[PDB]
Amino acid sequence: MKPEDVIKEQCARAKVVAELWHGFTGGAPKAALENLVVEFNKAQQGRCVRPVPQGGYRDLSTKIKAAFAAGKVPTMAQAFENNIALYLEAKALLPIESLGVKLQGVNLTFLNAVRFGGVVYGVPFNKSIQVLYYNKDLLKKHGVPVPATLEEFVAAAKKLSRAEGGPVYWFQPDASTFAYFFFNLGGSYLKDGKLVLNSKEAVEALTLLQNGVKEGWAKPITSGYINQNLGSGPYAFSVDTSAGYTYYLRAAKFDLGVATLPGRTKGQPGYGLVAGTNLVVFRQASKEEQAVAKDFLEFVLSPRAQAVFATATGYVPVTEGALKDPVYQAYAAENPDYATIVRQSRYAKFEPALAEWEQIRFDILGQAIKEAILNKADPKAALDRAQKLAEDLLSS
């Protein structure tokens, strides 16, 4: 018997049911959200949340878009800062504090990202940071220290690739990976409020990956997640969401390591991209459903839910109080990778929160990167196209 079966029974016996639409397809992410919900529904009396999966995050935003045209929205859903911008244009979201959820203790990084015109419209739930995943066995084999700087990372990738007869830095040719190299070469997406995809730090960032592929140290992964490709040739490293931690752990036939990101200098770990989502509450929800929502968002923000959620998944705890929880502390004492993910969460950067950003990162920026990496398009001309499409989409 599965936790979504318990939930189906729990809700059928309930006077009020709050739907939560999500983008967890399977794995520990889906199981930790379901378990959370089971625990919550137990302490209720004919109150409940029903998690409704919708596919991936892009399937979710599309089905929420349609949910609006159709007249029927859930109580709650997962949303990136930029999906929040979109829903705010149609006035669809309740301010979280008017519900009376106490947000003191919530990481200010996470809280600032969900705050529009001084007003919070999301609760940070499943917040991820990019880490350096690596092959402990392979680095030990060649007396290669864990790279601390961009410089050391390129030199180490070249040294292990040469030794093993194939490219050891594995990456997806996507906006998220490009974000790592863009940010840690001084790059920023807004210039005096104008979204810029073709700045010289963009060109340098795409060039680096393209030169990496050409020189035989970087491996573009074109089918599935990196952790779904492990075991086909030598793997030394990947820059990837802390939310992949259980999938890497399940897949790796080598000793898995997690480290902070290489940065420009040893003075600081490089910035990681923040991903995963915030929970929003829809205005269309009834008073009753909104009360379940408030109660559920306080449970989710409770140190124990946050400790269990984050240790079951590798997502970053969103509250100071999660780190003082004994369950957190017990997992951290037997597993240093948790403190490494938290340490990396301090050097965090965000993508723009423009309504059009979901579309831009996938269909325009993502495609420019794929042109460059897979079809050997000039980085500058690839991104210059992107800049033009982005501008056309926005003008619209």
Ligand SMILES: Nc1nc2c(ncn2[C@@H]2O[C@H](COP(=O)(O)O[C@H]3[C@@H](O)[C@H](n4ccc(=O)[nH]c4=O)O[C@@H]3CO)[C@H]3CC(O)(O)C[C@H]32)c(=O)[nH]1
């Ligand atoms: N819709 C929409 N999506 C966005 C936006 N900005 C970024 N992203 C996506 O967020 C993923 C990161 O969010 P995160 O919670 O850190 O990680 C995800 C999964 O990545 C990860 N996972 C799942 C299965 C697996 O085998 N391995 C694994 O690592 O587990 C989590 C739950 O699915 C990127 C990756 C992507 O899925 O290709 C698309 C990217 C946006 O604005 N909108």
